[PDB]
């Protein structure tokens, strides 16, 4: 009375993610007026979200609904690697976009000199490579493997897939993937807000006879509310093994997945994108 209908939500999420990401990619690729150095970061972010929505989500949905993993252990390890890869790549691309905006507003004359067409490709490749070294290299060689008896029983059996991780791997991965980008983005947006307030005050002083707050609020709040509650419990549940159950962890992780769907509605609402979308349909 629950399974026969609760798959509708997963189907809707999959459809929304795939449609939004493919529409953004098609709009950027097809029309030449959208070709910009800043738009390449959005292209990489959309590609990461598309891969996530095409691979990670359906298999997880099958895992919860069926409650068994029909496929082998090799596919389980591959799925975990893809999950970690996509998550960290997306979160790092967000910080890259924020730093680009910081450089755009803070230093207006030499914005062009710092970043060109060729440098963006190198930045994106380095971001994806650092993302890859976090997931595939440790998982495939079995560095994260736990040691307690329940983990051994889960790992030996070929029909169960429960994520058991070492303390050191969890801490290092969380620090590399979330907290450093969080700090960088906070500092960047604080400086940007200060500059905007100064300019607004200058204009009001010039023309003798509030708006950036909402713009910063959407971007900060969406990311923080979507990805902060997951990493708190991720860090906590390794130090103490009795506080956090195995269902709240899954619920928070799936809450974090939805953040891929909201990215096109935040970073791709410019008017030129509106003309591009209107022309397509
Ligand atoms: C199966 N879910 C995984 C488990 C742990 C983990 C995730 C995402 C980013 C990380 O850095 C992680 O360590 C989650 O998506």
UniProtKB/Swiss-Prot annotation:
**Recorded coiled-coil stretches:** none
Record-level Gene Ontology MF annotations? adenylate cyclase binding; amyloid-beta binding; beta2-adrenergic receptor activity; identical protein binding; norepinephrine binding; potassium channel regulator activity; protein homodimerization activity; protein-containing complex binding
Any idea where this protein resides? Cell membrane; Early endosome; Golgi apparatus
UniProt PTM comment: Palmitoylated. Palmitoylation may reduce accessibility of phosphorylation sites by anchoring the receptor to the plasma membrane. Could be depalmitoylated by LYPLA1 at the plasma membrane.
Record key words, sorted:
Cell membrane, Disulfide bond, Endosome, G-protein coupled receptor, Glycoprotein, Golgi apparatus, Hydroxylation, Lipoprotein, Membrane, Palmitate, Phosphoprotein, Receptor, Transducer, Transmembrane, Transmembrane helix, Ubl conjugation
Q: What is this protein called?
A: Beta-2 adrenergic receptor
Protein family per UniProt: Belongs to the G-protein coupled receptor 1 family. Adrenergic receptor subfamily. ADRB2 sub-subfamily.
Query: Which parts of the sequence lie on the Cytoplasmic side of the lipid bilayer?
Result: 29-41, 100-120
Subunit structure, interactors included: Binds NHERF1 and GPRASP1. Interacts with ARRB1 and ARRB2. Interacts with SRC. Interacts with USP20 and USP33. Interacts with VHL; the interaction, which is increased on hydroxylation of ADRB2, ubiquitinates ADRB2 leading to its degradation. Interacts with EGLN3; the interaction hydroxylates ADRB2 facilitating VHL-E3 ligase-mediated ubiquitination. Interacts (via PDZ-binding motif) with SNX27 (via PDZ domain); the interaction is required when endocytosed to prevent degradation in lysosomes and promote recycling to the plasma membrane. Interacts with CNIH4. Interacts with ARRDC3.
Q: What does this protein do?
A: Beta-adrenergic receptors mediate the catecholamine-induced activation of adenylate cyclase through the action of G proteins. The beta-2-adrenergic receptor binds epinephrine with an approximately 30-fold greater affinity than it does norepinephrine.
Any S-S bridges, and between which cysteines? 76-161, 154-160
Which residues are modified to Phosphotyrosine?
Answer: 111
Q: Which GO terms describe its cellular component?
A: apical plasma membrane; ciliary basal body; cilium; clathrin-coated endocytic vesicle membrane; early endosome; endosome; endosome membrane; Golgi apparatus
Q: What membrane topology does the UniProt entry give?
A: Multi-pass membrane protein
Span within the entire protein? 31 to 340 of 413
The main location class comes to membrane
Q: Which residues lie on this side of the membrane: Extracellular?
A: 66-76, 145-166, 240-246
